Amino acid sequence: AMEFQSIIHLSLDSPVHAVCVLGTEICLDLSGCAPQKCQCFTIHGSGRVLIDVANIWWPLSDPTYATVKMTSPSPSVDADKVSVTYYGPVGTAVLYLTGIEVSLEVDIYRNGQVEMSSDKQAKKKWIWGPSGWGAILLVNCNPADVGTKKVIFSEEITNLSQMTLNVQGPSCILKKYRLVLHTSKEESKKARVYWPQSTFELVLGPDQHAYTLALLGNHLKETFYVEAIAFPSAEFSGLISYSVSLVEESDPSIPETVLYKDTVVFRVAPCVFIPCTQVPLEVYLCRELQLQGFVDTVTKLSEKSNSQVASVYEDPNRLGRWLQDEMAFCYTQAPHKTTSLILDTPQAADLDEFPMKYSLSPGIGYMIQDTEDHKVASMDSIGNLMVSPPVKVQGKEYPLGRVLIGSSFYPGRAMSKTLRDFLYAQQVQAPVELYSDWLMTGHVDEFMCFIPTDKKGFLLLLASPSACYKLFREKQKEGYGDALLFDELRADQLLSNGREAKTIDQLLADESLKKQNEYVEKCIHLNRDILKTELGLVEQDIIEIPQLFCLEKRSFARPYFPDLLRMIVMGKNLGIPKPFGPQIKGTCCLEEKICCLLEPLGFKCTFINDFDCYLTEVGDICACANIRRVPFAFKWWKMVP
Amino acid sequence: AMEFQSIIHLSLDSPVHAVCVLGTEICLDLSGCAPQKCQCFTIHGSGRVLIDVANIWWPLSDPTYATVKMTSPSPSVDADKVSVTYYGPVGTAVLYLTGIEVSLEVDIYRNGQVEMSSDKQAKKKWIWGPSGWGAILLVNCNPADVGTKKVIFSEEITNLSQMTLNVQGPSCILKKYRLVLHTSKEESKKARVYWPQSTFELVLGPDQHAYTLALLGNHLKETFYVEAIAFPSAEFSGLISYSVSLVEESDPSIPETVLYKDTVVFRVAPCVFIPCTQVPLEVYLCRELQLQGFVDTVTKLSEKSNSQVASVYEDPNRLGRWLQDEMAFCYTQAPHKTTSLILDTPQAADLDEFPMKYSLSPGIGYMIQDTEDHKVASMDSIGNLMVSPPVKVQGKEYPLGRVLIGSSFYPGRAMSKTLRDFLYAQQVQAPVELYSDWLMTGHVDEFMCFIPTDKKGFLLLLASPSACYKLFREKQKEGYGDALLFDELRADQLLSNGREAKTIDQLLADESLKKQNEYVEKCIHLNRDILKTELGLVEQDIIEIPQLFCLEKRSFARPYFPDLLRMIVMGKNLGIPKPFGPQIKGTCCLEEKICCLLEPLGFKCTFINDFDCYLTEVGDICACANIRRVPFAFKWWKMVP
Ligand SMILES: [Cl-]
Ligand SMILES: [Cl-]
């Protein structure tokens, strides 16, 4: 008999000639051919064979099976043997073996190189955690792709994951078969596989899910380079598997058959967002022909903070403040490479040009993410997200922090199912839903800010209208009720921005303003509870920041004076919006209050003088920034979501 | 001051009057108002207040917080109090409390009744396993729905899950608020909530995701009845949450605000498929005007097995064998109720009538599942599924077995992404992909069958052409080479079914038939390996069944003689297709062989005489059956997928 299978029925008469793929086990039926007078048996194998008898003689039970496996490939056909000798009160059975290797290997232990997997079945599984395993694939974020044969540079080839195919066996056995490297039609739309000729040929991708390789000689060693196309999403878990099938070429009436298949599994790394507690590397600035105020002060602050400034062009096809509202700096990481990128959720239709590519420093990626709602003040954009610092909550670690999404509480505007599903599909920053649709912009950054400390490693700052009323009341009692909110601002600057200079006395007697702020205070308190619960915070982690709001067009909250919470956080250097509060002998009481709260904790407060920038209405153009920061040192794959 | 929040800043001057929702905690800032001369303090609360000072006097630290909570609702406003007395080398601060209850409760401990949850935050989580928690919801499978105010019978109301809402507090506090029972727009499409007036009003559902309730008096107690619409799928995880928001009615210029929200989570039970090792309860039979053969023998076998027979009408709008190929008996289970149902994946377009409803015994549900591919021999149907018995594999338990799906191995036909995703979304029967597209029907039941034993509790039978060649060779050597395959069958019965009577000598000399069977044997061996690996089977669990195949129109395998593996499994009673093998002195050697293999294990073999039924071509009409069985005793929620 001639065979390629997991079960072999030995025959006293004809010895079996079989193929053994290395890493697999064959079950040997020893008793089916045994003579009736046989009571016991002995079994012996050659050097490359490992025989297991239920883990020397053995009693002959009703079923008697032995398992065999091979340790190295055969240098010729039938070079290995297993012999069974039947003892009674009488027969021999023989199996000739030829061992071949057919294996696909990846960086399964996440060490930065392809390593041989210890087990053919364990290698199809992807296990999270430090005691886990499973290779990682990175999405191609090359900004050129935004809007068959390719040249790939040594700088770009490190982004790709290796997948090695090894086949070893006698030439006369291997020539009977063909190899097919493949994946399912659906998985092929999610990644590309390249083969170097440097010049690389596309062997698998969205239009090709099977690739044939000829077996010429006694060994084939080929390395393929793989890249993902998309991050995990509602429709995509992140898992992609590749297989090599050994196909027996046929007689035209009998179809071909697959005799063996080896499979590897990749997990496409998630898109990870970065909180403002991470060290700034670069500050991207969309100036919109501005210099004095925001642009100059933020340029100065950035130099003071060991950070680069990258100019950003205006995009005439987008609403103003797009650099902040439609984009986020994030990263994606593999054992062999970390790719920082900007994730863009454009609100405009049919875009042709992408001016943000001029600013992107070498190696910085660019990815687009679709959304559904594109109106002014839409919360369906990546700007409607804030990242917490790393926290432990109820004994559960969130080493990369948790993503915070602005949402609604009235049973209004919201993030689309598409963008929300994309976020939850990343897994490693378990999203928390906050309440922000009471704010005109819908952005939580108008009432909260995390700042790093040199303990949890951070403090949460929260907007507090009650704290501001308390501060103004104390000043009034001290005889400063005549001090003026919006002092040192030009009358037309106030009028053109919907504001009016008011004394502390007029502000404290304004019952409508007080009711607007009481409403805002209730909305912030709802969020304070969710943040304490979901981030494991205690009140010692929170600092109240005096901040007034007003309701504009139900109506929505807007900062009354420039929002102190809208900080540019650069380590210990804080770029705080200059609020223009009531002055008490040449000093703004709001600047003095916030400096008294933050300076003793090691913070350097720089007040950004730019009233028009901070009072810009939603949709209107203004200078803005987006800071690119150091990715977390904690490796995402070692987390157990 | 007047408040409803998680943080209260005490004031030496004005005492605070606050609302405390039961089950929540308030943080009290004790140090912010403390006099400069104060060095230590004492705190005292009344009977309903629980005070925690970092878990009698206490030192006055820079931040000094105390947490308070309430144990029962207040019978009047300010009926509870907390007093802080400041000691120096000097002041008092007071908080008046009013406790209210606002809670949604479900059968969170899966005990069959609504129980009070121990924690407001833990109740939003759904944890798998015996030490888990989380209420369960059942899909409405009423066959009437196949194709605002409702009457629900005491028999049908047990299918629904209870959700109780309790609100308790002073009438003068509760009258300030409104209650809103709600869920997101997307979740509302997945379930219906009813309120009894018995006659039940639909309060939440696909067209209504918010329902308002008036707070009249000092307490509200309402029970709602919930039912799911759909099983988990590609787009639906199975989790649905409901909330009650306490809304403060507004001054028209200030929008309303939500002061508190309580939330419960349900998991819609998965659709669980049943293996043929479970005890038969009812046999559904589509006779198609037939009596002698299949219909009579299966009716007899069913009576012999303590099972009911339910006649099924012919469906002229569907391909033949639809009762078996387009339907599956499955179940869905909650702590309070188990619903057995038939899951239908119709292959026809625009169906109006559903004759299977006439057969459905009282209480048996009916659900439809969409598919994409509707051609003849399509593997995109629920008939392309077999369920394994419960198994343990590599230390992992599959107490409900694993679903087995027929698929392809040539890198052909396949299950659609829609049906496959529906199956994997159930979670509790971790699907295994087998190779069956080499078979004309694409059904794994043509080469494998599980039978229960009175140890794993089962045996796997596998089709084996090699075993059949071996049996025929032994008969030839004994002088019976003249024995005839298809003996005792009429010549026209053979001709009209594409077969011809052949002696054992002619069969063993047929080289084309041998090559067709060698091909089939390689395909079955691929599946034997996957089954051993994925189900943790050893060769002692497998019995080879002699069975020949032939290739017909690449070409596809069909059973050559009636397929012995296509058994009607009724406990120890097996309805085996009568194969009409070569007879050796009045006995079919195939019947004798299978009886020698199965009878010593306690099986009673009944050979179903019906050649035309077992040789029916795909798409053609024939009598067939579908057996409804006992659901597993193991509760699905106690598994950790
Ligand atoms: Cl996953
Ligand atoms: Cl889930």
Residue numbers in the entry:
A (entry chain A), B (entry chain A): 8 to 62, 73 to 106, 112 to 169, 177 to 226, 231 to 283, 285 to 445, 449 to 491, 497 to 595, ...
The publication says:
In order to understand the impact of these post-translational modifications on its activity, we designed two phospho­mimetic mutations, S10E and S446E, and included them in our final construct. The tertiary structure of PAD6 is typical of the PAD family and consists of two consecutive immunoglobulin-like domains (IgG1 and IgG2) followed by a α/β propeller C-terminal domain. The crystal structures of PAD2 and PAD3 exhibit the same head-to-tail assembly. Examination of the PAD6 crystal packing showed that PAD6 adopts a nearly identical dimeric arrangement across the crystal packing, with a buried surface of 1986.5 Å2 at the interface [Fig. S3(a)]. PAD1–3 bind calcium at equivalent sites to PAD4 except PAD1, which lacks the binding site for Ca5. The sequence examination shows that many of the acidic (seven Asp or Glu) and polar (one Asn) residues involved in the Ca2+ coordination in PAD4 are not conserved in PAD6 [Fig. 3(a)]. However, Ala676 is flanked by two cysteines (Cys675 and Cys677) that could potentially act as active residues. In the structure, neither Cys675 nor Cys677 are favourably positioned and oriented for effective reactivity with the substrate in PAD6, and the I661–A678 loop occludes access to either of these cysteines [Figs. 4(b) and 4(c)]. Additionally, in this structure, Arg347 shields access to the catalytic centre formed by Asp351, His471 and Asp473 by occupying the substrate-binding cleft. In PAD6, the residue corresponding to Arg347 of PAD2, Arg355, adopts a similar position in the vicinity of Asp353, His480 and Asp482 [Fig. 4(e)]. The activation of PAD6 would involve the displacement of the loop I661–A678 so that the substrate could access the active centre. In our structure, a PEG molecule from the crystallization solution was found in the vicinity of Cys675 and Cys677 [Fig. S5(c)], suggesting that this conformation is not rigid, and the putative active site can be accessed by a potential substrate.
